[PDB]
Amino acid sequence: ISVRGLAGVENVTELKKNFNRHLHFTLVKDRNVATPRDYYFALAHTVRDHLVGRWIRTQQHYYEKDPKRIYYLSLEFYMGRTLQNTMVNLALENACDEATYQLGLDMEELEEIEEDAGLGNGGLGRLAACFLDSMATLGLAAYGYGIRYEFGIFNQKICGGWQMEEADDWLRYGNPWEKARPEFTLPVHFYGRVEHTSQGAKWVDTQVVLAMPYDTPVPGYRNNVVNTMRLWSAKAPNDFNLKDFNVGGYIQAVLDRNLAENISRVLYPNDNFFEGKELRLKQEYFVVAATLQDIIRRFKSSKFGCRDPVRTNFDAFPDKVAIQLNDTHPSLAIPELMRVLVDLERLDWDKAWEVTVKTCAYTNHTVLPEALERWPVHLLETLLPRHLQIIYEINQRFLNRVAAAFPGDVDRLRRMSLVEEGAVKRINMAHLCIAGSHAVNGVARIHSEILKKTIFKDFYELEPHKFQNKTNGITPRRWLVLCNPGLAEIIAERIGEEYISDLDQLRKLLSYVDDEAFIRDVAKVKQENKLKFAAYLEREYKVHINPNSLFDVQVKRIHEYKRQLLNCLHVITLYNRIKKEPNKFVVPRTVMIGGKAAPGYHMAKMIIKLITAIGDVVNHDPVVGDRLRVIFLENYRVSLAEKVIPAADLSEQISTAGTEASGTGNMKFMLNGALTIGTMDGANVEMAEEAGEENFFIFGMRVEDVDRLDQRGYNAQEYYDRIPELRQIIEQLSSGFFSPKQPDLFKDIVNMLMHHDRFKVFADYEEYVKCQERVSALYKNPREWTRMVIRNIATSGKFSSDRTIAQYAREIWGVEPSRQRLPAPDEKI
Amino acid sequence: ISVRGLAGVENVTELKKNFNRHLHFTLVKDRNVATPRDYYFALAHTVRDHLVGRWIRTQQHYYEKDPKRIYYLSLEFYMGRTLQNTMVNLALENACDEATYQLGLDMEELEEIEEDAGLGNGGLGRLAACFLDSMATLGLAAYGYGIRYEFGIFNQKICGGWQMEEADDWLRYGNPWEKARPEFTLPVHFYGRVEHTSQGAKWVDTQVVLAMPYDTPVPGYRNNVVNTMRLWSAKAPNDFNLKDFNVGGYIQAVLDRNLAENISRVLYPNDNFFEGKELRLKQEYFVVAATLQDIIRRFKSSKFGCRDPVRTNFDAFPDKVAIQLNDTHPSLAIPELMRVLVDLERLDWDKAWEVTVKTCAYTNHTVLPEALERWPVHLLETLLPRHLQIIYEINQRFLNRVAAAFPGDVDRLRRMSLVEEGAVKRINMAHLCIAGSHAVNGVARIHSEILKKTIFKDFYELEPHKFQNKTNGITPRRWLVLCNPGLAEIIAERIGEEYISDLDQLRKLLSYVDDEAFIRDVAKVKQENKLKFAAYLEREYKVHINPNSLFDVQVKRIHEYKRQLLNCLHVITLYNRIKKEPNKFVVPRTVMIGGKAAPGYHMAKMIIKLITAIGDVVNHDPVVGDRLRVIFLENYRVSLAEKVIPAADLSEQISTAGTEASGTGNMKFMLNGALTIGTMDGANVEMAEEAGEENFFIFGMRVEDVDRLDQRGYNAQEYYDRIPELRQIIEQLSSGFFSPKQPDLFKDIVNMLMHHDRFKVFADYEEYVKCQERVSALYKNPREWTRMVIRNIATSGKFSSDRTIAQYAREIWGVEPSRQRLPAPDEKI
Ligand SMILES: CC[n+]1c(C)c(C(=O)OC(C)C)c(-c2ccccc2Cl)c(C(=O)O)c1C(=O)O
Numbered sequence A, B: 001i002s003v004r005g006l007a008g009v010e011n012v013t014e015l016k017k018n019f020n021r022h023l024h025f026t027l028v029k030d031r032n033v034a035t036p037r038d039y040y041f042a043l044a045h046t047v048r049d050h051l052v053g054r055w056i057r058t059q060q061h062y063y064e065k066d067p068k069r070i071y072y073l074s075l076e077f078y079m080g081r082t083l084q085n086t087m088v089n090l091a092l093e094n095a096c097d098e099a100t101y102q103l104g105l106d107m108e109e110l111e112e113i114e115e116d117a118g119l120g121n122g123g124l125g126r127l128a129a130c131f132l133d134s135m136a137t138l139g140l141a142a143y144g145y146g147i148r149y150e151f152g153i154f155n156q157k158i159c160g161g162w163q164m165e166e167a168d169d170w171l172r173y174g175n176p177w178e179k180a181r182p183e184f185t186l187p188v189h190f191y192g193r194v195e196h197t198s199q200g201a202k203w204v205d206t207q208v209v210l211a212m213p214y215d216t217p218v219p220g221y222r223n224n225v226v227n228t229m230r231l232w233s234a235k236a237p238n239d240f241n242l243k244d245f246n247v248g249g250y251i252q253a254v255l256d257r258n259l260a261e262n263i264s265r266v267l268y269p270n271d272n273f274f275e276g277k278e279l280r281l282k283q284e285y286f287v288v289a290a291t292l293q294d295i296i297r298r299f300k301s302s303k304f305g306c307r308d309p310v311r312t313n314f315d316a317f318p319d320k321v322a323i324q325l326n327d328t329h330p331s332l333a334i335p336e337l338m339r340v341l342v343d344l345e346r347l348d349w350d351k352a353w354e355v356t357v358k359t360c361a362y363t364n365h366t367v368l369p370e371a372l373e374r375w376p377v378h379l380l381e382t383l384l385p386r387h388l389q390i391i392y393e394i395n396q397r398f399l400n401r402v403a404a405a406f407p408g409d410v411d412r413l414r415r416m417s418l419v420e421e422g423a424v425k426r427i428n429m430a431h432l433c434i435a436g437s438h439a440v441n442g443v444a445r446i447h448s449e450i451l452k453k454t455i456f457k458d459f460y461e462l463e464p465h466k467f468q469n470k471t472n473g474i475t476p477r478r479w480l481v482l483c484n485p486g487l488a489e490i491i492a493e494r495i496g497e498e499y500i501s502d503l504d505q506l507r508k509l510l511s512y513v514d515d516e517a518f519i520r521d522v523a524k525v526k527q528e529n530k531l532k533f534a535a536y537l538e539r540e541y542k543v544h545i546n547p548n549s550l551f552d553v554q555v556k557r558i559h560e561y562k563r564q565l566l567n568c569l570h571v572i573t574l575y576n577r578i579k580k581e582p583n584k585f586v587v588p589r590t591v592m593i594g595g596k597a598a599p600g601y602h603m604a605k606m607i608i609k610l611i612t613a614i615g616d617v618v619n620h621d622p623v624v625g626d627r628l629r630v631i632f633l634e635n636y637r638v639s640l641a642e643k644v645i646p647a648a649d650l651s652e653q654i655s656t657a658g659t660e661a662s663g664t665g666n667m668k669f670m671l672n673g674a675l676t677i678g679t680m681d682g683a684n685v686e687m688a689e690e691a692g693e694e695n696f697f698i699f700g701m702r703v704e705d706v707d708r709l710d711q712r713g714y715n716a717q718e719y720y721d722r723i724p725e726l727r728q729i730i731e732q733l734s735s736g737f738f739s740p741k742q743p744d745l746f747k748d749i750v751n752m753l754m755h756h757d758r759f760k761v762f763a764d765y766e767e768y769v770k771c772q773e774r775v776s777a778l779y780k781n782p783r784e785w786t787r788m789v790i791r792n793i794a795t796s797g798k799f800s801s802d803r804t805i806a807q808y809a810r811e812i813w814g815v816e817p818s819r820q821r822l823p824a825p826d827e828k829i
């Protein structure tokens, strides 16, 4: 593969030299007693050395030049592994592959030893990761800020068909990529009270937790740019902690240091669901306070403390600082920036607010109400007394604006208020973000329009100019060149390598739909990947699948709105039809469903159980043979995504129209040569637009159809009474067919489907099964299946995070992207 | 246009010479006083002379060679005009075009003077016409037999928006193509009684009507074959009529001769509907008796009366005779052939039956029950006493077979009996045909399967080997080269002319989907035809349409099962949407609906009235402008079909799944460059299969969906309650919106739709409108619309009647087709 770079004789000897150096000096080992993990670490370190030169010069470059800086504040950074990604972006893969081979080592075996930096739940967490890669690739002075969780998203094990959670101890043997910067440690204050003195307010009597920053290098694609991901780690105060004059014992007081450090211990596993847990609120404030202090320091250090003429001011703050809020998670950045500016820097309220709004921008990722953050005011009053006061003042003045804008419209005031009334008063974080931001974007065209028409309609009416769209993207480096070198190889053979960082160029492939060689290659590459995945599944899990079958795959967090249940209905349909007519030929299929369920999300765990329950019957029916196989892939994480996606034929994106804001996995599948069967939801719409609906497999209700159904009332019983194939399945579930020793096992799934389905699974069942029929018809003809695949890959260009980021930069941040190769080669001399 | 043949200098002078000869000697006129009609007649005669040589040698050829003969018995022969068709098949078009131009005449103006030989109602009548053209083209010894109606299908005029019927007096100024053969006149017997004497039965005391045969030449495509269409004309008996010893007056008795001759006076205008009128039964027997006598005579004349050794026998009758029944119209041919063979030729019943079944074959054209012939036995007993006795004996023995085949199955006997019991005993003609035929075919794959699964299931179980499929075809000569020379021109420029009589060759055009010249030409040709049709409509009817708009056309006999009403709903939908959002761009459309309604079919005439009522509002709304136009084309006949079809963009084929047996107009549209929007019914299914569903516009319920609906019960109110756009239309109709001065005018249409719709118009409304939306999206892009047109034309090859006929020949008739050019050039020397 030529996209993997050069394996020069000198660079290779140098790599082996440095590999051996690290094994000896850094691992204190020798060939005779080193373990595979020692080898992976020796290689990782050797690779990291190549980043330091660029890493330092990049930061110096921004310091010298003083460009506006972009701050991506997120509570998640689903980075996955770093080794291969670092090699790819620096062009060291073939050289390192050669060097490790000369050393009698298999580089791919070593890559598998590395633990995923799984600090995310799903979509927005991984969006942050792709975004970092793109901002670096685009030469933007961008900095990622988050929490250095000790434990990321739990590792999922399946035991007896059920999901089992295990602590994701990814820091166990260390992390060779991060570098702590003790000198940048900062104090984060909690609790206390507020005392309004002579001139202003003061937040006093607080408990302190220190935030120690750990830097991780973010390398752009072969442009000598290395940006930084700064994650905060919580530490007990060296000072006051034990000096609290406590009489509970010296030992207990020391052990008690655990309490404060628990703030950065584990990522909350809630995908699209808000749980008002205080530890969570602490984590959110933790990242905001530290991050903002760091930003302000960096802002002050451009000799802006040296503003003698006119006097030191923060007027230029918005021209030098951009803070992007990934969801409302870091929303406290609004009141925090105001607290700092008014309480500590003594700016007048009005000027401080103008600066705050000009600095921040919020991004929404869902419309589901249970996903939005509404913190009880008592929780905010106890833990962040000063912040709640500022939120109230922000609200008062915002509602004064609304009032003057819409005189007499009382209910609008009630609806738009940051303060939610009721048994438990709460603060709507989304409203706080809209009020304190200059831009509010959605993550897909359809999503951005719904925001303006529904949940943020009132805000859209008050400030139309504020709302935007920034359709999600995925990075072509991790998501193509990294995970699918075979496909990137053949593409490169025809159109060169320019596309890796200019994905629209993939369109040139439309000139090959009838090219006989290309149709063969694209098919061989997919068959190779499918062959590869089958091997991984047999060795890592002793599974075994039919490589000569259609790989139907649905991988994403388990949710009701994602409708893995619909897919279940379809799989049982395929089973019943085969049982009905055994001698009737059907296109062989390997249905793969994967994803983690949030602990405590009962329905989600019941669904994972059904998927394996179905497999237990289907997978062992002799009549069925290898014509159908239902397999649940455990521990779906970024690393598995990079393996299964490149092997997929059909990409399941069947969420109820209007629920999935955009999705990004759908984009990953398109980029890798899989055809999509999905609703007109999220980015699926733009994906179909780009490739052409004739090249897609759209089905089911459209948003207006869902709304019409809601208007008259959804009645699952109707669908059950009118569809005999559906009725047969439901009766199979309810009678114990898929749970012999526990007949009533899935009675909750049945009950929900029949009486409490907010996602109308039944209403889309018929059109979905027929659509799948079409999928198999096409698969029956390899040449046309492939040619259509070509038309999708050829049009996935717009879904590259480079494009997304370029729009944020120009339309929200106010900075111009670049692709100019930074000089920084490495400081060897 | 090169497909029009050579215009040699000599052939042209010869034509002008002969043209002038006829004008003088045959029309007894001179240039100074001839009328346009004189000119058309002079040309027609000149052209007919060219057929005589081949005409005589062909008949001599069959006489000498003695091949098995194929007899196509039909009560209809929708021939349309003959002039251009004769020129095309003889290659005289350009020569005649040149010659008439030299004579200062416009040949196309002369062609318009010719009257349609409109002896058919629709589908099966025109199928017979295409079939004749193909059998000649295939060098088969085939003979067409029917009635020479004085008045064909009434000419439709629209007066005040309503249909008005006028006698179609097509023989008014004579018919230059036919040639009467008095010497072949034969007696047809009616009424009387039966007397069972010593040896056998005798049909005595009958009233006689004579059948005088008129021959019309059927020229094959440039292969020097000219077959014959022999139509019978009814004449009063020269003898007994006035010699009936009547005392009602000499004058009255002479005037009374009209009564018997009324048998061939007018074609019954019932498309797919059975009316038990005795005059109709007489017409049916009339054709059968005469035709069979002629066949038997011809059979006897191969020196088969000279069968000295062994004795004269009819054993070889099936090896020399094939009688194809176009529907059950000529079904009496079964008992007639038996009557002749047993009563007159004295064959034993058993041998006579074996011969009859081996000779005949029946073709079904519909499953609608109201269309099937069930003649009361009293009508059959009074008018054809001997035939009813034979039908009873046929039935007795057939039911004896069924009984021995399915012992104990009494209800099967009742179901399969030729005799239908009830208040009025009747005879099921379809059952008679199945029982007395060796082959029973359907006219489309889906149609032929339904026959075996539903109405003729019992018969299919008794004799599976008997049932077949013969998917309809259309002739590429009349239906392409004749009506669309521009399209045939461009096609010929790329692939030659071989396709005109080998349509599968059109596939070669798939090699031009990306050919820039071809995409331009196909589009220019369609634009030319649309330009041409617009001119015909402005001069012949002073209509005026927008040539720069999508030509949406639905032309076929007006019926409820054809759902011109659905199209109506859609047209009003397009109107209401425009009214709703005036400034919203819509693809301009010219909706054209045409077809005749059977007199007395109330609903059909109400529908024609609504189509013009809608036009009266739509066509005069200024807001609407030239964005939409609803136009009803009056007097839809073969001649209009040849003009409007080549100008069509979209072909409406929206019948309820399972009702339209095959259709052939759908095929005409495909062949001429129009895309099809239609249900999965009839031939639409095979058409979509051939071109590819991605190249088609299929929508609505499938046969099983209709059946599921029937199973639970169709309730139009549901659709009305759930679809607000539908509800708005229905209320427009019911409130008098489309009938101001007569608010309750369409209350019958509304009532039927809401409560008595056997064709579920509402159930297909939503999917139909959305499908149309797709149609317009494609039309918005000329290049892709055309490229898809190319993919349809390229795949219409299987719908050529040459293919259909070749299957009848080989699979039913037992004869091998040919394309060998007959020698017959013309007897000039
Ligand atoms: C004084 C300007 N900066 C610069 C040239 C840096 C550098 O050389 O970093 C290299 C070791 C990777 C860098 C920096 C500064 C001090 C301690 C640790 C780091 Cl990491 C930063 C930062 O805030 O992280 C800079 C900034 O801007 O304030």
Ligand SMILES: CC[n+]1c(C)c(C(=O)OC(C)C)c(-c2ccccc2Cl)c(C(=O)O)c1C(=O)O
Pocket: B055, B056, B059, B060, B061, B063, B181, B183, B215, B298, B301
């Ligand atoms: C004796 C054999 N046939 C033959 C060569 C024909 C002929 O020369 O026809 C030409 C004038 C067009 C033709 C025929 C015979 C007698 C009167 C009129 C015709 Cl039209 C037919 C027929 O039945 O019509 C023949 C037949 O077979 O019996």
Ligand SMILES: *Cc1c(COP(=O)(O)O)cnc(C)c1O
Pocket: A121, A122, A123, A126, A555, A556, A557, A636, A637, A638, A639, A641, A662, A663, A664, A665, A666, A668
């Ligand atoms: C890309 C990604 C997601 C998001 O997938 P969707 O199907 O868009 O919800 C979730 N998890 C992982 C590990 C991912 O790589």
Ligand SMILES: *Cc1c(COP(=O)(O)O)cnc(C)c1O
Pocket: B121, B122, B123, B126, B555, B556, B557, B636, B637, B638, B639, B641, B662, B663, B664, B665, B666, B668
């Ligand atoms: C071909 C033809 C028909 C049959 O059309 P369908 O739409 O198949 O019912 C009817 N009338 C005329 C004049 C025809 O040319």
